């Protein structure tokens, strides 16, 4: 479309030339929360519909956690054409995160590095914000537009499991699914929650708390993992997920690795790397996790998705749904309709009746 080319070639590069990435982020959230958007003309066709996690998803393209950390722009994100929205990560108490600057653009790599450090309005603020639109969300969900909430841990928390449990109790009743984020590269000690004994204990507590919620307010629980795990780590996660009956996996968060070939001047900043250099690392992690769980655990695939081809590669690797974030920062709102339109065309070209038929297709070749 003309909007796609206009955003990608004119509007977005101009905004990027004028604003540091954090200011750009804050502006994006503001414009989105106000519905000031090109408003996609793409009608979701039936072949993009997916049923998973106890819900219908009108299309399989979601906005990844971190864009709307505090639940301020949920409705504008659906207007942008996302099939589902994940907010967060949200921590129990409000916290400021790391000192600025803490977000860095690598335009030559179509990548971002961030070290926000879980800046969060906290559970109470987000709870009230979601309560104010709770019935509007119930309608959206019923119409195939579910809401996910991603939970984090405070920097000074003395008991990680109790932080997550508090999030389940407070935001679980407002969410279609919850994500236990044990994969931020930007909170000391967080990723070691991915180890076997620690993960089993943590997830047992989260699931107990979830199961204690009333039936209509009981969300699916997913675990979001890093792309930097050892083979042993991945095996252990797969085993725990199956033992406890975890509902799904989100694969993957940002990477602390710095792949050979990064060109951006800021490539050596501390933080998680997202965008194109993460893409195939994430796809391969999806492929491994799908195999280790025998295709029985739904996976949301995320990392470097910017086109229908990228989305379909993750779906064929084993993802039931995909998310993007970094691509929005480069291409702007029209990227959402672009991914959906290209995905539909490719499904047709590859002889799939719909997204559902393509899930895990590479493992059946
Ligand atoms: C600026 C920024 C902030 C993020 N914040 C969070 C977060 O709070 N919680 C989370 O689980 N993931 C967070 N992520 C990770 C994204 O959800 C996603 O896993 C990752 O960026 C890979 O997708 P992408 O390549 O499409 O950006 C963040 C990513 C970025 C770039
Ligand atoms: C009508 O025009 C619109 C409407 C709605 C949204 C945008 C829009 C603008 C932007 F500057 C960005 N960029 C970022 O958020 N950068 C970053 C986010 N997190 C780390 S860096 C965006 F993603 C979207 C433009
Ligand atoms: O807040 C952050 O720093 C953050 C959290 C997360 O889960 N992933 C990420 O890349 N950054």
From Swiss-Prot:
Source species, domain of life: Eukaryota
Other remarks in the entry: The identification of DHODH defects as the cause of postaxial acrofacial dysostosis (POADS) was obtained via exome sequencing, demonstrating that this method is a powerful tool for identifying genes underlying rare Mendelian disorders. Exome sequencing consists of targeted resequencing of all protein-coding subsequences, which requires around 5% as much sequencing as a whole human genome.
Disorder association: Postaxial acrofacial dysostosis: An autosomal recessive syndrome characterized by severe micrognathia, cleft lip and/or palate, hypoplasia or aplasia of the posterior elements of the limbs, coloboma of the eyelids and supernumerary nipples.
A single Gene Ontology CC term: mitochondrion
Membrane topology listed for this record: Single-pass membrane protein
Keywords from the named record: Disease variant, Flavoprotein, FMN, Membrane, Mitochondrion, Mitochondrion inner membrane, Oxidoreductase, Pyrimidine biosynthesis, Transit peptide, Transmembrane, Transmembrane helix
UniProt-annotated binding residues for FMN: 65-69, 89, 150, 181, 224, 252, 275, 304, 325-326
Enzyme Commission identifier(s): 1.3.5.2
Record text on cofactor binding: Binds 1 FMN per subunit.
Keyword Mitochondrion among UniProt keywords: yes
Family: Belongs to the dihydroorotate dehydrogenase family. Type 2 subfamily.
Name of the coding gene: DHODH
Originating organism: Homo sapiens (Human)
Function description: Catalyzes the conversion of dihydroorotate to orotate with quinone as electron acceptor. Required for UMP biosynthesis via de novo pathway.
Residues the record marks as active site: 184
Pfam families linked: DHO_dh (PF01180)
NCBIfam families given in the database record: PRK05286.1-2 (NF003645), PRK05286.2-5 (NF003652), pyrD_sub2 (TIGR01036)
Assembly and oligomerization: Monomer.
GO biological process: one example: UDP biosynthetic process
Compartments where located: Mitochondrion inner membrane
Catalytic activity: (S)-dihydroorotate + a quinone = orotate + a quinol
Description of post-translational modifications: The uncleaved transit peptide is required for mitochondrial targeting and proper membrane integration.
Residues in compartment: Mitochondrial intermembrane: 1-365
Enzyme class: oxidoreductase
GO MF annotations, alphabetized: dihydroorotase activity; dihydroorotate dehydrogenase (quinone) activity; dihydroorotate dehydrogenase activity
Record's protein name: Dihydroorotate dehydrogenase (quinone), mitochondrial
